[PDB]
Structure formats: structure tokens, C-alpha cells
Curated annotation (Swiss-Prot):
It comes from Cellvibrio japonicus (Pseudomonas fluorescens subsp. cellulosa). The active site is at residues 261, 373. Residues 1-118 form the CBM15 domain. It catalyses: Endohydrolysis of (1->4)-beta-D-xylosidic linkages in xylans. This is Endo-beta-1,4-xylanase Xyn10C. GO terms for molecular function: endo-1,4-beta-xylanase activity. Its main location: membrane. It is an enzyme of class 3 (hydrolase). It is a lipid-anchor. It comes from the Bacteria.
């Protein structure tokens, strides 16, 4: 604020002549030693020719008001001056006077253009090493799809991933049109480079995803299919067989999301129709779902086959349709080894009782239960009556609520899923600086990055979320306190 609150100040015997407000900021006449300008609680400045000639220095300073003697250390010498940038760094008490003053035998004027003024540890060495049985502790990464966040070019991503995880999912580059952009032209280069790095680092890879209706990654030739239903289904088989066979041979790819998000968001729930190219191009049929599983099993009988979805942890209509599908597949000998609960949850919804009940329904059918995409939104437009209780900026209370919530979810997973049915827990991203949720809810969020849903902050430092996750793994009581 360079248009309100500024004062002339004299620390020496020479009187000041106040300040002048202009479009440039705040100016004062450097009348003598200790004459300056201050405001109440890093600068940009431009000094006059008479000031440089004077040989006088500039002193940024701060002092407690009325207890005046208590930060003399700062100094910008005349020789450092010619529009410059000047920075300055007992400070905390429960009124502070700050500014800059001329030192020496000054003359001319000083214009100040701007002024701005500006570490938690979870004490977890390696999150993966705390797992009470040998199940994957995993993370989604960016690859060539993000110039900024690509695992293979971003050394901060590499460091956090190496430190804590032992299992990886590609955020986008193993999706359908990324693997087969045009008919018959498969592209394995970038995803092979990713798998190689995982292998080099003793991490296994979860493949995401063989079949998924989301329009931006449906291959154009599939979206625009103009042939028969059976030839479409034959094309879908070729897509799956080529990719599964290839990754079987590469090694280190242990499980696939075979079909992702085939169930609608209605109540009661049904398989997707008009919004799925797979339903429409198969001739208005959901036979492609079971077929994809059969085709994937034939291509690599050892790879673990998941059906993956969101909201199936809520224990309502979507959960029911998912369970009915699994039972139907079992009754008809359609191969399926596990269910992936994406687990994109809110802070207070759905309840741990419901999440646990939903996972247990899959446990009781003898299948693996894998948490594939866990994150915990601090703000989420469908939760806690948003925006009535919007949290912005992020607070310590919300970070501690998030610690408890991560702990509660991981504990529920451990309490519900027997050792040999644990397919893993993975979180959907590393740093809050790059969560998918901020883009997904950008309209509701008014383009602000306010979901803060992951284990590490924008600087890759630990959040209490990480401590909550570890607390669950070690059987420590889940709390929202340090
Ligand atoms: Na592993
Ligand atoms: Na094969």
C-alpha cells in the first residue's frame, strides 16, 4: 500500500518535510541525516541525481512504536545506487514502524515505487516402509503431458517420489488416445521411458487405463467409428491386446485399470449410455465391459485386472451397481481380480462407516480392494455447503482436519481389507501445486488453487496430511492435533 499510511520521519535532529503521493508511489526530500518515510504495521526505489551526488546511503529500518530504540543492521550504500531493488530482513510482539531514511549528508529526493514483505515436518523417513503388510504405497505422476511436472524432467518430483513411494500410476500418458492416437499406430516411447524409470527405482507400475469413456482421450477413430458393432468390438480387443502384451513383455507392470468409470452417476445407477462411445459404438451395449476383461486376461494371465471408479465408496446407488456387476461377472466366469476405489473424498463426506461398508462388499466377494486415486479436498463444491464455509487461504485448522481425514481413510482400508486382499493405496499426485482438482473445479473455485488435497505442499514440503497417513499405517490414534 503506497497510497495510504505513509509518513515523514526524522531519526536525527534535522526535521523532515513529510511525503508526496504520486502515480510513482511515495517521495520524500532527503533533507538531512535520518530524514525518511515510514508506514505502520523488499522495496523498489528511484533516487534523484542530487541524491547520488550527495554520497548518502539509504537505510531500510524498523522500530517498535513508543519503544523507539529497539533493526539498525540494514544499509544500501551510495555506490549501489544509480529504479532499484532494495531488500531488508525480537520481531514478534502483541505496532511496528517501518520505512527507509537517508544517511550521511544527503540532498535531492527518494521515490519509493513498491514495498512487499514476506517449516513443518511430518518426521516420516519413507512412507512406504511403514506399511504393516507388503502392499503398494503409490502415487500418480505427470509425464510428457506436463512440461512443468514431468517426472522425468522435474528433479523435485523425482526426489519426493523416490523418498516415499514404491508404486506409480501415469496421470495421462497410458490413457487410450495417448497409447493409440490413430488406428494401428501405437505409441509406447514415453510410457516405456516412465516404466524404465520405475524399474530403475524398484517401483511397480499400475496401468491406467485400458478402456475409459472420457472424450478427450478416446481415440478419434473410435469416437468417430462408422463401421459395424462387431468390428468396433474387434478394434477394442486389438487396442487392449497390443498394449497388455507389450507391457507384459516390458516387465514391472503389475495391474491394470481395465475399465474405468463405466457406471453412471444416477440413482439408481446404470452403465453409461449416450455419454460413452463404447456403449454407442458397440451397438448400444455394455458387452464391451466384460469383453475387455476377457481380452486383457487372455493377453497376460498374470496381470491383475481392476474395475476402477469414483463414488463407489459412498455406499449408495453406484456401490450397488458395482457390486451387482461384480456378482454377475463371477456368476458368468468373466475374469476380474479387484475393484479400484478412486477415493476422491471430501473432508467430512462420505462417512468412514460407509466407505468401510462399500470396501467390505468387495472383500466378501473374495477380490482385491485397491485405493487408486486418493485425495482429500479442503474445498470441493459438492461438499460442506460450498461456498458457504469456503476456506481461503489455507489454515492450520484445515491442514489438521486433513491429517485426521487421511488417517481415518487409511485406517478404514487396513481395518476392512485383509492382508492378502490389499491391492495398494495410491494418492493422486505429489504436490498441491499440481492437483487435478483445481482444474476440475476451476469454475466453482473462481480459478483459485484451493483444493490443497495432497500430502505435500506447493514447495514439496510435508503437510500434516503425510503425518496422518503414516499414523494410520503405524496404528497411532487418528487426530486433528499435532
Ligand atoms: Na513395490
Ligand atoms: Na501375451
Amino acid at each position: 500500500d503506497m497510497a495510504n499510511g505513509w509518513r515523514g520521519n526524522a531519526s536525527g535532529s534535522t526535521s523532515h518535510s513529510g511525503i508526496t503521493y504520486s502515480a510513482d508511489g511515495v517521495t520524500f526530500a532527503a533533507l538531512g541525516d535520518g530524514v525518511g518515510a515510514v508506514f505502520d504495521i523488499a522495496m523498489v526505489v528511484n533516487v534523484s541525481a542530487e541524491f547520488k551526488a550527495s554520497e548518502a546511503n539509504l537505510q531500510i529500518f524498523a522500530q517498535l512504536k513508543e519503544d523507539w530504540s529497539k533493526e539498525w543492521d540494514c544499509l544500501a550504500a551510495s555506490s549501489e545506487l544509480t529504479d532499484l531493488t532494495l531488500t531488508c530482513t525480537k520481531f514478534n510482539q502483541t505496532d511496528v514502524q517501518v520505512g527507509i531514511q537517508a544517511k550521511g549528508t544527503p540532498a535531492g529526493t527518494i521515490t519509493i515505487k513498491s514495498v512487499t514483505i514476506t517449516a513443518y515436518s511430518a518426521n516420516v523417513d519413507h512412507l512406504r516402509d511403514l506399511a504393516p503388510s507388503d502392499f503398494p504405497i503409490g502415487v500418480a505422476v505427470s509425464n510428457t503431458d506436463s512440461a512443468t511436472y514431468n517426472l522425468l524432467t522435474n528433479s523435485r518430483e523425482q526426489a519426493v517420489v523416490k523418498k516415499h513411494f514404491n508404486h506409480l500410476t501415469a496421470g495421462n500418458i497410458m490413457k487410450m488416445s495417448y497409447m493409440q492416437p490413430t488406428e494401428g499406430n501405437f505409441n509406447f516411447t514415453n510410457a516405456d521411458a516412465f516404466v524404465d524409470w520405475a524399474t530403475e527405482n524398484n517401483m511397480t507400475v499400475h496401468g491406467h487405463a485400458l478402456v475409459w469413456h472420457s472424450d478427450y482421450q478416446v481415440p478419434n477413430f473410435m469416437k468417430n467409428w462408422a463401421g459395424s458393432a462387431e468390428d468396433f468390438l474387434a478394434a477394442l480387443d486389438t487396442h487392449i491386446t497390443t498394449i497388455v502384451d507389450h507391457y507384459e513383455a516390458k516387465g514391472n507392470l503389475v495391474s491394470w485399470d481395465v475399465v474405468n468409470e463405466a457406471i453412471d452417476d444416477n440413482s439408481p445407477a446404470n452403465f453409461r449410455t449416450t455419454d460413452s462411445a463404447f456403449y454407442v459404438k458397440s451397438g448400444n451395449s455394455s458387452v464391451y465391459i466384460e469383453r475387455a476383461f476377457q481380452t486383457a486376461r487372455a493377453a497376460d494371465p498374470a496381470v491383475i485386472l481392476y474395475y476402477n471408479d469414483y463414488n463407489i465408496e459412498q455406499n449408495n446407488a453406484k456401490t450397488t451397481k458395482m457390486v451387482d456387476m461384480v456378482k454377475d461377472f463371477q456368476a458368468r466366469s468373466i475374469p476380474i481380480d479387484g475393484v479400484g476405489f478412486q477415493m476422491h473424498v471430501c473432508m467430512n463426506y462420505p462417512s468412514i462407516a460407509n466407505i468401510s461398508a462399500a470396501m467390505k462388499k468387495v472383500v466378501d466377494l473374495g477380490l482385491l480392494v485397491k485405493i487408486t486415486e486418493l485425495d482429500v479436498a479442503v474445498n470441493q463444491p459438492h461438499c460442506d455447503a460450498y461456498p458457504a464455509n469456503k476456506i481461503n487461504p489455507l489454515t492450520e485448522a484445515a491442514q489438521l482436519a486433513q491429517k485426521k481425514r487421511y488417517c481415518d481413510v487409511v485406517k478404514a482400508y487396513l481395518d476392512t481389507v485383509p492382508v492378502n486382499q490389499r491391492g495398494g493405496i495410491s494418492v493422486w499426485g505429489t504436490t498441491d501445486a499440481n492437483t487435478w482438482l483445481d482444474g476440475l473445479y476451476r469454475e466453482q473455485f473462481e480459478d483459485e488453487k484451493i483444493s490443497w488435497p495432497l500430502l505435500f505442499d506447493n514447495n514439496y514440503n510435508d503437510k500434516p496430511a503425510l503425518r496422518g497417513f503414516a499414523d494410520a499405517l503405524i496404528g497411532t490414534q487418528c487426530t486433528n492435533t499435532h
